[PDB]
Amino acid sequence: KEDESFLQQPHYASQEQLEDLFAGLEKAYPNQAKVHFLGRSLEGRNLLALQISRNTRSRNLLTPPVKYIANMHGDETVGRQLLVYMAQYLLGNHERISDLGQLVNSTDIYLVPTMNPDGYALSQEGNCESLPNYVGRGNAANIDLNRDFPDRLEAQSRQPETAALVNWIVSKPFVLSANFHGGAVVASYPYDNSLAHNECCEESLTPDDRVFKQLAHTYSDNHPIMRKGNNCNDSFSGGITNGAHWYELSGGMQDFNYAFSNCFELTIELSCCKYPAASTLPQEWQRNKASLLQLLRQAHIGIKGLVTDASGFPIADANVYVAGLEEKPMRTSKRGEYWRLLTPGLYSVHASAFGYQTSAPQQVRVTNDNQEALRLDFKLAPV
Ligand SMILES: N=C(N)NCCS[C@@H](CC(=O)O)C(=O)O
Ligand SMILES: *[C@@H]1O[C@H](CO)[C@@H](O)[C@H](O)[C@H]1NC(C)=O
Ligand SMILES: [Zn+2]
């Protein structure tokens, strides 16, 4: 069975240990592991993302790009190690274990163990609670990166780390995403704030709330402890919550994904203790293992397709609308691809684009039973 050797030596991987491991994977696995440079922190540390794919050279048409980010708050560390574990796990098992082999073949996966090296470096292993000043939580300038992203409710010069990720997030048609935090145990989804700007305990839901709730439940349902809902003195029905309803915050990465791209990002809290000890890590792995795989496979629900010429040629930046979800259109990729995550049910989908007559609508029955999103294409005539 499984090659999970990465557990035989519980410890937190340093910046050097991380760069070193990502290079090894790249040479260990020439065609499926590739390292991407996103940028650098204030203090020179590399912000890196390991891509895993069927073929790292390109992205197969209609393969969903997805990302996992961790450790944006430097003192919230478990997610960090879990992503380090995932990388090894996927690679070293994908040819041996069918499910995984199939996961990897069908999904374009990016792993970012840390997004705040400087923050991490300043944090102290063992601290369940953050430090004085919230040192380690924010970056080297002590600003909270989860307040530093553009807000949907209203041109860089943010923190290096923010800017890097902003650039990245809009650079590819990411379909699904999650970022990991510590302090509590719960699956949180958009929106994190509202026009009312309420302190807490008031839902600020998303047009795609159903799907979001399905995503959050996918992770929590598969997490033996999160599923409970009464962790760290918190009470979260079904182990999930709306960001805003928990408490509002502005400038977060989560809502930035949704509002400025196609991407559907969840916020996931892994532990009550922000920075637990290594010996804890092997347990955290076994719990989150299923929830991290199953969530990834949620990037396959709904539909996907091509908006194309009469020349049968891809229209980029086309819009694909779903009746009742018209406030969140999908914008096609340069190759005219789109993936529209959907809850089970039946929908009328249509596509439009400037200089093109808006397509006639198509009705589709979305059962999320099969391995890959239902194909559904569009040809548009120029006006
Ligand atoms: N209440 C909302 N909107 N989100 C909770 C998750 S992010 C939060 C908690 C964390 O850092 O883990 C933060 O402070 O950024
Ligand atoms: C994944 O891709 C490999 C190589 O293309 C192929 O041999 C295999 O059938 C695919 N599916 C898996 C690993 O289940
Ligand atoms: Zn956090």
Side-chain angles (χ1 to χ4, degrees):
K1 211 198 188 197
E2 314 166 300
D3 168 9
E4 297 178 277
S5 67
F6 51 84
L7 316 166
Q8 191 87 166
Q9 46 100 274
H11 76 296
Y12 282 108
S14 71
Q15 186 61 27
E16 191 209 351
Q17 291 202 297
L18 170 56
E19 293 172 339
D20 290 340
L21 190 143
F22 272 11
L25 265 26
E26 201 167 4
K27 50 177 297 184
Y29 302 89
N31 309 24
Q32 357 218 205
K34 179 172 175 53
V35 170
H36 301 271
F37 169 90
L38 308 188
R40 262 156 171 140
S41 77
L42 286 174
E43 301 180 319
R45 307 185 205 264
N46 281 326
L47 283 24
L48 298 167
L50 189 73
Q51 163 189 24
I52 299 166
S53 56
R54 175 125 118 164
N55 163 32
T56 227
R57 295 204 81 264
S58 299
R59 213 193 81 258
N60 300 122
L61 198 73
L62 289 178
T63 294
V66 183
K67 65 231 211 308
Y68 274 160
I69 300 88
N71 195 235
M72 80 178 313
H73 298 106
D75 45 18
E76 303 170 11
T77 58
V78 180
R80 159 185 274 251
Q81 271 311 119
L82 288 185
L83 285 184
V84 159
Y85 292 160
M86 179 64 55
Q88 297 169 85
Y89 183 83
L90 284 177
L91 280 174
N93 286 275
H94 89 269
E95 291 199 337
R96 5 163 38 107
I97 283 64
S98 208
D99 278 323
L100 301 176
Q102 208 281 342
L103 179 66
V104 173
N105 276 9
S106 52
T107 328
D108 227 61
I109 299 163
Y110 298 79
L111 310 181
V112 190
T114 180
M115 188 191 147
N116 186 8
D118 291 12
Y120 173 70
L122 291 150
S123 299
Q124 176 183 166
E125 180 183 340
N127 266 150
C128 286
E129 289 103 84
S130 185
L131 286 170
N133 300 135
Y134 282 100
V135 160
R137 178 178 156 98
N139 70 3
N142 266 120
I143 87 92
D144 186 330
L145 295 174
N146 209 19
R147 307 308 191 255
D148 199 36
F149 286 77
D151 192 44
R152 56 193 186 90
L153 306 163
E154 187 88 6
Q156 294 342 299
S157 200
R158 329 248 181 195
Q159 303 302 305
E161 295 88 2
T162 315
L165 266 90
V166 165
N167 271 16
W168 192 48
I169 298 164
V170 296
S171 85
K172 300 188 167 181
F174 288 106
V175 168
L176 167 53
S177 173
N179 78 112
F180 303 90
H181 293 256
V185 197
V186 68
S188 183
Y189 51 97
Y191 290 116
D192 279 346
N193 74 356
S194 66
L195 274 168
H197 292 102
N198 306 319
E199 176 186 35
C200 86
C201 326
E202 235 154 345
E203 286 183 328
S204 174
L205 303 174
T206 258
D208 273 286
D209 198 56
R210 305 167 97 189
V211 166
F212 265 118
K213 260 165 186 157
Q214 182 164 320
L215 296 174
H217 266 124
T218 303
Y219 196 101
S220 186
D221 285 6
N222 281 282
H223 191 300
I225 289 172
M226 188 174 299
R227 185 171 58 227
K228 302 187 170 301
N230 48 2
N231 317 306
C232 351
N233 289 158
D234 299 326
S235 176
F236 289 124
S237 173
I240 67 174
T241 187
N242 171 234
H245 191 267
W246 187 358
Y247 56 88
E248 288 193 10
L249 70 88
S250 302
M253 183 167 62
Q254 182 194 267
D255 287 6
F256 168 90
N257 278 263
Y258 185 63
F260 298 85
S261 84
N262 289 329
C263 197
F264 290 27
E265 177 165 295
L266 293 187
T267 312
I268 297 163
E269 302 283 1
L270 299 168
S271 49
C272 285
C273 183
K274 295 183 154 186
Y275 204 149
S279 63
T280 272
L281 307 173
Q283 266 112 146
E284 301 295 5
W285 166 254
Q286 235 68 223
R287 310 172 163 170
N288 295 262
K289 194 187 184 174
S291 315
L292 290 152
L293 276 359
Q294 291 305 289
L295 186 176
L296 287 170
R297 310 204 80 120
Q298 285 289 293
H300 297 286
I301 66 186
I303 57 177
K304 64 173 175 192
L306 304 172
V307 175
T308 196
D309 254 352
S311 301
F313 183 93
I315 313 173
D317 257 82
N319 280 122
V320 171
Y321 288 95
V322 176
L325 299 169
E326 266 129 334
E327 286 181 302
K328 183 52 166 166
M330 289 300 106
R331 178 258 223 114
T332 67
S333 76
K334 291 161 184 194
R335 317 209 292 249
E337 339 170 67
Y338 77 87
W339 306 255
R340 177 65 182 174
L341 302 190
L342 289 170
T343 288
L346 73 70
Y347 312 75
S348 273
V349 195
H350 79 356
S352 56
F354 176 73
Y356 291 86
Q357 308 183 341
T358 304
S359 75
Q362 294 172 49
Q363 158 203 74
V364 67
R365 172 202 297 128
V366 174
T367 170
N368 290 318
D369 194 335
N370 179 64
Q371 273 179 331
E372 295 187 42
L374 280 155
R375 174 76 95 95
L376 185 71
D377 296 352
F378 298 90
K379 293 200 165 189
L380 307 184
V383 293

